[PDB]
Symmetry: C2
Subunit: 811 residues, 2 copies
């Protein structure tokens, strides 16, 4: 299972065969304009909103897969082909694809003609730039034609795919020079348009899909390309497209360069028209002139490379393992930044039709990208807090575009408020900026009810205290971290919602997972309360935390592992008494992270049980045994076939918490063994089984009860990456931000001799060399800073813009 | 422009080339199981609900068009083809398709092998039956393989096309004998499943799409078919399919027969499982045994033919024009019945994702199908009335599946309540059953507030009286008959609803069209009040009607035609003073139908203006001149490019009202000339311009301002078929149901010598021969019944199950 390899010097993944197990994609764009592009150049673009500003059309779950994108056709004396091998799918002499940081390259050769295309979105630019090089590597003079093709969307994906009865009559275009402008509904309430341009004189164009392709033809053989000539069609309803055609003559060894741009323009309502029925193209002219030569494109490309390099430079590892180096230094951080930029909107599994991301999802992503973009993290934290309700609860879905909560989805997921405390504590530990606590933040997006951010944290903390169950454990509500564990739903209707349609009062079912999370984040809440000078409130919160710990030890432990929950009948969930689902993974990680059972051997016993019952070669499953029938009292978890999704699937996100707990109990070999089973670089040798991108994490991998055990689903958009990076970089390697500074506390395999981490922290750089002469897993024998031994394991803060050498000797 | 011809003896349309200008479709099923099938066998099936019980997957607006259906592959020694020519699209020796009444036939031949398939849904059967005949017309022995293929839907089209993140892990099947059962989510909350069976022993099967087709292959060349062998794949998530493979051996001249069934089964929650994880198949066994021989299939086919013949037999014309005979006798009535069965749910332009049909559309379809199914019409009328609100208004969208109104869509369309009166009057005139007036009908689906159906009519009538505008004309509200004329919207934001998001109070803008409709239906309301004995309440309603007629004559007439409306500024709409939209079509038809301006030349002048400004060779446009820019004060009508949809498009529905109005002024030549311009059979010779089905009406044809002038959109599901049939059958030909009996009053071209109509009416048959010896257009000189001359133009009611001869002499 290889269809490629890693190129670490260029920070790329190189795909060497076009028929990957699944189309492997990449993301372009940082601020507003975004593109999804596959290894055959399939995908689509949008402007800040995949649902309401889609620029090009893409068909999900299509036959054949991934049909539709930025398609270049080389036509040579009757023959024709594509650089990406698709859609034509004629055999190429050579094919290569490269997925880099914010850009993609595709190269293809046939009959002595080579075509190389680079796709990327430049910084501060509302478009996608495609640099195309055609080269004659044959011995004879050639006369060819180049066709470009994209397919427009009508700005609203849902309407675009459902409301044909109106929108087959709305499509409009303009053609001027070498630019095709898509302007559907620009005559009416819309004030934006799209354009496709090339920086050379064209020999023909096409804008009607039925003219360029043909009604009964597909993308693999458009009639205009088959004939070797454009039809110069002007769209009038139906499906607008954009296609240029240029006739080229290449001598042997001669090459030619072209720049294609897919751009988006917004005009002011008073500057919409150049004349009656003619759109104002001034901004399009400026955009097209920005990149009308190859030198300008190359300068922008180098600027993007420098931008991504600066983003990835604050944590740099040097170890003996090149897979670990590649994961930590490039791809984990890249995925974290991409998730921040994109939310949960669009992938090849997310259709881009949703309205927002999870509140806890944003809070957890912050934990991953906080060290790369601290100020944007501060702004995101404030925006998230502003949507909280006055009672301390939060809307399940956050809308980053409007920075609002989803009123129609509701706010009864009882783990959500604690993630805000966790993210705020992480941000403060990263930056040391306590001032964020004193900011005035509205409640429910209402400035009249605004209070301090610390008050938001207090209300989140006391939301749990005010909703305890009969055993003193938090009430689970609709669901907790596991969105499919619905203990108050009791649904019997196929179309009914499992999460936001409840038939129970919700006063009995309890979550042990929320209890562990509460004990874990209470430490940070108490520490922050002491900073604000509120000592009595800190003492009271500590009392509540102690009560919760006692409740967990009295009603949350089963004998060899921690229970999962209590259902609406007051019966145990995740117990050896149950026939199925005897042990769950979620209740173990957070319980051990909170340091419950460290001295009496309960945490170690629970982790041993986790290894015994949940471990597979591809990671740890959610629960064991799997559910073989529907349990109306458990909700959506039992509606999947065994081994899939939350019915005993493998989730890297909750595997990372078991990794952290394993470090907590001081077993670094086990932590790293768990890490390698799910880390993308370590499973690249079995790509055919994994079937999805070998350079990013996926949400779920089929568990041992499934027939496709080892196959992944829902890649590229998931909170797994953030806490996986946290677990590797802070809990295993031991470079942990802390309130007073940088704490060193590795939990590593005994056989390692050492490693080096360069960390940018609070205005300075720390070059930390770890040594393991006695080959232990945990414990620091000595720390030296600038040649002087220090006391403790907290590094001093300098904030002087210089590099300080740190020597850590373990033992 | 022919790609086929009419076969009137078999009541079929025969398509002789597979590449029609657009895929031409047909509908199968009468009661609960429904199928859309194209001329290449594309389409899909569902059970009563295209949105929530879709059985097979179909992709709208796909490239290439219409890919996905019931696909049979003939594999012959390496070659392979399809009888429908699609999806393989290899050249056939012969191809034919036939669209009949409730069934479709497709025949194709290649390399001496002929395959013909008949698709239909039998009566009282929850499935689609496909009878396949293979024949060796060659000279040598042949050994071939037959593949059958369908692609399943996951029961919920919207979820099926948006929610891949969950539903790529839910697909499940069972395979037993020659049957593939699709049972996705049957394990949790669904009590229904689907199956695909063949009545012979199979040599192989496939149920995983990626195994049968291949990830990078399309429907045109599935890998299993290319290899000539099934893979026996069992679906596990992703895309479940159903495919059979049978190895056949045919001698020269020998034929073989097969029956394939796509069936739907619903089980009781207690009889769901045969054993643990095994679905109960008893009902599937009974269904499959019902049609396991060709004799049973043929018997069911003849029963369906008899059913449709009985449906079409109540109105039979015999004239000199075979196009008119074919339209009146077969296709108009067929379309009316299909619209009753299907509502507005699914076509090749309606994606099947909506949740109901229009209230006015439901009432207007009844005027077309009332003479075919009187008792079902009575039930439908009662169901529609039950959803009416207490103030007399109605929900804009009706839900026939639940017989409810759409609460979220609103009720401020001020023309809706009058259509209920119109439909009730039509039903009573058809049947003479006044008892419906005294039924107890709930208000807003609330039995506590129920009253008589006549009370519902009264509240509908007085909803207009209580919402008059400054000129004494009805307030238009959100919209009227024309849903795109929004005079209270003033929308500036995209994605915003034009019809249900108002910014003005709605106390100024008036509709002249609603005024004409009110005057037109007031006659029926007064007649019904007189029948109910409420003589005082009929005098007051007559006073209101007279006041409205005076208001129309004082503020609704522009000088040579009737005005259209007044906007929120109190300014005229549809006036010669306006720059664009000087005259509209809607305000003329209903005004003349109400008989306003008959004795002073106003109606004739308005009709002459309609002829002068709105007439094109393809029908009459909505308004002239077209709007060339957005008018915020007019709403959605201005958002289309000129000549398309409501911006000066051609709508047959409002052309029919002009036809009736032309009959009212006694100009039968003009009425028939308008009728022929839009009647399907008369435009079959220009099928390449029309581009859509030549046997059914379409909603809209591009107007003279459009570049595609003459091209149709949104065919096969409409309201135009009903009133077009009414206009031809009652207003031109003059066989009009009346309160006291059947009224004869033709308005025909002067050159016609006569014709004959056999009408089934109120329990008897009338064989009416019309003669025109003096060649007039209107006026009845004599009527003779059973050889005896009668007085007046109302035929006596017999209700005796016999045939009575009627002789009408015009003059």
């Amino acid at each position: 299972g290889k269809f490629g390899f890693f190129d670490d010097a260029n920070k790329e993944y190189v795909i060497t065969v076009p028929r990957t197990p699944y189309p492997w994609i990449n993301y372009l764009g940082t601020e507003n304009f975004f593109s999804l592009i596959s290894n055959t150049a399939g995908g689509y673009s949008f402007y800040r909103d995949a649902r309401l500003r889609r620029i090009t059309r893409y068909r999900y779950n299509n036959v054949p897969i991934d049909m539709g994108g930025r398609y270049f056709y080389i036509y040579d004396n009757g023959d024709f082909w594509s650089p990406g091998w698709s859609p034509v799918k004629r055999e190429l002499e050579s094919y290569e694809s490269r997925h880099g940081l914010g850009y993609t390259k595709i190269a293809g050769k046939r009959n002595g003609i080579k075509a190389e295309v680079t796709f990327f979105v430049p910084l501060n630019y509302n478009g996608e730039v495609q640099k195309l090089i055609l080269k004659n590597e044959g011995q004879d003079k050639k006369k060819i034609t180049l066709f470009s093709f994209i397919e427009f969307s009508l700005w609203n994906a849902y309407d675009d795919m459902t409301n044909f009865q109106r929108n087959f009559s709305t499509g409009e275009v303009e053609i001027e020079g070498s630019v095709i402008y898509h302007k559907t509904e620009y005559r009416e309430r819309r004030n934006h348009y799209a354009f496709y341009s090339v920086n050379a004189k064209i020999s023909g164009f096409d804008s009607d899909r039925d003219s360029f392709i043909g009604l009964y033809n597909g993308f693999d053989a458009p009639q205009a390309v088959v004939n070797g000539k454009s039809n110069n069609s002007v769209a009038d309803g139906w499906a607008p497209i954009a296609s240029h055609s240029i006739e080229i003559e290449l001598n042997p060894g001669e090459q030619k360069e072209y720049v294609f741009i897919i751009g988006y323009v917004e005009n002011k309502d008073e500057e919409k028209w150049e004349s009656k029925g003619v759109i104002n193209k001034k901004k399009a002219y400026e955009m097209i002139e920005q990149f009308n030569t190859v030198e300008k494109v190359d300068k922008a490309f180098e600027e993007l490379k420098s931008y991504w390099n600066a983003l990835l430079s604050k944590y740099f590892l040097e170890s003996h393992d090149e897979k670990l180096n590649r994961m930590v230094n490039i791809w984990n951080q890249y995925q974290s930044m991409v998730t921040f930029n994109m939310s949960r909107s669009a992938s090849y599994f997310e259709s881009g039709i949703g309205r927002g991301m999870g509140f806890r999802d944003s809070n957890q992503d912050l934990l991953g990208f906080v060290h790369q973009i601290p100020e944007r993290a501060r702004e995101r934290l404030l925006d998230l807090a502003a949507t909280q309700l006055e009672d301390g609860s939060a809307y399940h879905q956050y809308q980053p575009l409007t920075k609002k909560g989803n009123n129609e989805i509701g706010s009864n997921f009882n783990d959500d408020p604690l993630w805000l405390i966790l993210a705020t504590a992480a941000y403060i530990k990263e930056t040391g900026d306590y001032s964020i606590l004193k900011e005035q933040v509205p409640f429910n997006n209402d400035p009249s009810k605004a209070d301090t951010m610390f008050e938001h944290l207090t209300r989140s903390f006391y939301h749990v205290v005010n909703n305890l169950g009969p055993h003193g454990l938090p009430l689970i509500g609709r669901a907790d971290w596991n969105d499919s564990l619905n203990l108050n739903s009791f649904s019997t209707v196929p179309d009914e919602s499992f999460q936001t349609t409840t038939s129970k009062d919700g006063k009995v079912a309890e979550s042990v997972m929320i209890a562990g999370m509460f004990v874990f984040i209470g430490k940070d809440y108490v520490k922050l309360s002491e900073y604000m000078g509120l000592e009595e409130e800190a003492r009271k919160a500590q009392q509540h935390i102690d009560a919760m710990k006692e409740a967990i030890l009295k009603y949350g432990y089963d004998g060899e592992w921690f229970l999962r929950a209590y259902d609406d009948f007051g019966r145990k969930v995740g117990s050896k008494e149950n026939e199925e689902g005897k042990i769950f993974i979620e209740s173990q990680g957070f319980s051990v992270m909170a340091e419950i059972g460290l001295e009496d051997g309960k945490a170690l016993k629970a982790l041993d049980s986790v290894k015994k019952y949940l471990d597979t070669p591809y990671g740890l499953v959610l629960q064991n045994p799997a559910f073989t029938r529907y349990y109306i009292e458990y909700g959506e978890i039992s509606t999947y076939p065994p081994g899939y999704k939350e019915n005993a699937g493998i989730f890297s996100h909750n595997n990372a918490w078991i990794i952290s707990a394993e470090t907590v109990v001081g077993r670094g070999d086990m932590a790293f063994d768990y890490y390698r089973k799910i880390a993308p670089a370590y499973i690249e040798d079995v790509s055919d089984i994994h079937k999805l991108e070998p350079y990013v994490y996926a949400q779920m991998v089929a568990g041992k009860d499934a027939k496709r055990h080892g196959e992944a689903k829902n890649s590229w958009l998931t909170g797994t990456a953030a806490w996986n990076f946290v677990a590797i970089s802070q809990w295993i390697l031991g470079v942990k931000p802390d309130y007073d500074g940088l704490k060193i506390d590795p939990s590593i395999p005994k056989a390692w001799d050492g490693y080096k981490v360069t960390r940018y922290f609070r205005g300075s750089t720390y070059e930390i060399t770890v040594k393991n002469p006695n080959h232990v897993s945990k414990g620091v024998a000595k720390i030296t800073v600038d040649g002087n031994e220090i006391s403790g394991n907290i590094l001093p803060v300098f904030n002087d813009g210089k590099t300080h050498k740190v020597e850590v000797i373990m033992g």
